[PDB]
Scaffold this motif. Sequence first.
Motif, short mmCIF file in Angstrom:
data_model
loop_
_atom_site.label_atom_id
_atom_site.label_comp_id
_atom_site.label_asym_id
_atom_site.label_seq_id
_atom_site.Cartn_x
_atom_site.Cartn_y
_atom_site.Cartn_z
N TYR A 213 0.37 8.17 10.95
CA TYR A 213 0.94 6.85 10.71
C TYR A 213 0.49 5.83 11.74
O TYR A 213 0.10 4.73 11.38
N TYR A 214 0.52 6.20 13.02
CA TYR A 214 0.09 5.28 14.08
C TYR A 214 -1.41 4.90 14.01
O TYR A 214 -1.75 3.72 14.04
N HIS B 272 -2.12 2.72 10.89
CA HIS B 272 -1.54 1.38 10.88
C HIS B 272 -1.45 0.65 12.22
O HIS B 272 -1.33 -0.57 12.25
N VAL C 114 3.51 11.45 12.43
CA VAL C 114 3.58 10.34 13.37
C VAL C 114 2.22 9.88 13.89
O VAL C 114 1.99 8.68 14.01
N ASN D 145 10.85 5.19 15.84
CA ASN D 145 9.72 4.42 16.36
C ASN D 145 8.68 5.33 17.01
O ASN D 145 8.28 5.10 18.14
N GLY D 146 8.27 6.36 16.28
CA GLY D 146 7.28 7.29 16.78
C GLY D 146 7.83 8.38 17.69
O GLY D 146 7.18 9.40 17.89
N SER E 212 9.33 6.56 7.00
CA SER E 212 8.10 5.87 7.33
C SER E 212 7.04 6.90 7.68
O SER E 212 5.91 6.81 7.22
N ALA E 213 7.41 7.87 8.52
CA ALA E 213 6.46 8.90 8.94
C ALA E 213 6.08 9.81 7.79
O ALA E 213 5.13 10.58 7.87
N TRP F 293 4.03 2.36 15.28
CA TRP F 293 4.72 3.65 15.26
C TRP F 293 5.69 3.71 14.10
O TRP F 293 6.34 2.72 13.79
N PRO F 294 5.79 4.87 13.44
CA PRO F 294 6.72 4.99 12.30
C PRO F 294 8.16 4.73 12.73
O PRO F 294 8.66 5.37 13.65
N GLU F 295 8.81 3.78 12.07
CA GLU F 295 10.19 3.43 12.43
C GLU F 295 11.20 4.55 12.24
O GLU F 295 12.10 4.70 13.06
N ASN G 265 11.98 8.61 9.85
CA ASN G 265 11.41 9.75 9.14
C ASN G 265 10.66 9.39 7.86
O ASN G 265 9.55 9.89 7.61
#
Lengths: 35, 158, 158, 158
Positions: free
Chosen positions: D50-51, D54, D47, D85-86, D63-64, D57-59, D61
Amino acid sequence: RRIVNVNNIKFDSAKLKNEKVVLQSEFQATTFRFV
Amino acid sequence: FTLIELMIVIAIVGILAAVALPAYQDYTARAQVSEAILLAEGQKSAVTEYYLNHGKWPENNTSAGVASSPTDIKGKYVKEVEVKNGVVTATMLSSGVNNEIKGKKLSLWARRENGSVKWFCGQPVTRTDDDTVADAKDGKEIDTKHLPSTCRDNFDAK
Amino acid sequence: FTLIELMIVIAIVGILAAVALPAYQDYTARAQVSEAILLAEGQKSAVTEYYLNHGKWPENNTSAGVASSPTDIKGKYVKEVEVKNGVVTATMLSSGVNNEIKGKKLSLWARRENGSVKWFCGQPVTRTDDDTVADAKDGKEIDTKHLPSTCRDNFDAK
Amino acid sequence: FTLIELMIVIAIVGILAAVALPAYQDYTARAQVSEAILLAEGQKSAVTEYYLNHGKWPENNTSAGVASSPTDIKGKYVKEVEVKNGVVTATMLSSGVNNEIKGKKLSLWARRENGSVKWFCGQPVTRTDDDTVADAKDGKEIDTKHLPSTCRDNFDAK
């Protein structure tokens, strides 16, 4: 105080490159059980 | 008649420390070696450049252009780092380390790729010719168990 | 006539907590200090770069290029982290910590190695000249017992 | 005429278990929650990266970059761990846990520090905007009594 008759001895320098002193030693020693 | 909860729980923490003793003692040593490795590296630069620019491996630290004194490249667990014909060896101090790894060392050596070189990391080695090294077999090598997965290279790794 | 098993075992767990009290209370403090150390570090980067690029130690956080406000580099047990002439000191909060370590602090300082620097970790220190610091003797230093084995450095460590 | 020592001492151990029952039952639950927390963490890495990489926040799992399936991040007392979302929430299983904590959960969320982020740990929360979350008030939050001192954070903690 026991029957360990050491006989044929050998030893040599165990380090290939010889960068530190070290002697591997192989001694032969025997005791005599009954038959 | 009664008091066994205090007696057992003081004796389970005692045995818990004895079980946690060898885990912290190799995690610990494995940690002190991971640094000998970091101190050995970063000296790859000097050695690499010296080789690519001249085609001959740096004979010693001064040649490689690094603290002319091996002992000047020491650390907390590292008693030093010497460059011997492109081979960089790191020695473990005698104070502040595990117990079965002090005074012990590893080596980093490279190989001509032709236009570049590739580095290896493992137990002490000696350089024979410009493209060949061999186990510095002598008894002071850091035990395989203390070496990272990235530093398990053999004298003939290619 | 009878009931002593319940009375003794409630009183052995009571005394077990009293024996487990100081162990958890220094393990605890020693844990809250290990963070003041982590908050102090990671700021070595800024300080190291500033020194190597300019040859002068960063006078304060802003110079080092970090939260211009000491209080902006705080934590749970850390009330802050200030950079004073390359020396980075971490202060222990007043709430959420042991009892004999709050409002107490440590320092991280470096030394010119010439081309690079080496870092030290220990009890509060002040910088005198670009290559010399001294005990910030004043009474608010975190007690040796609470400091890791890796942060026992003296003002004159080299 | 006689035998009361056996009768009372069997009945003091019986009542000793009844007194030791609630102590082992919250120590126990408090232990099963301390893991939901460990399972929630270690996913901070994904997380955080990812943040920072980019700025969003990762939408979820995937995404993360973690077990695309929430249920794939379960444990003994943990039925799962979802990234929304993180915000990373950990759910307590239904089998093998206390009694007033099963199917209950907590959350870990972070906040932009600008160049880095800081993490919080507490009762379930929902993310509103990239820098604001709120109590996921609904009734399934793990009760404050079962949460560590390090995981008492409120939705508006800064």
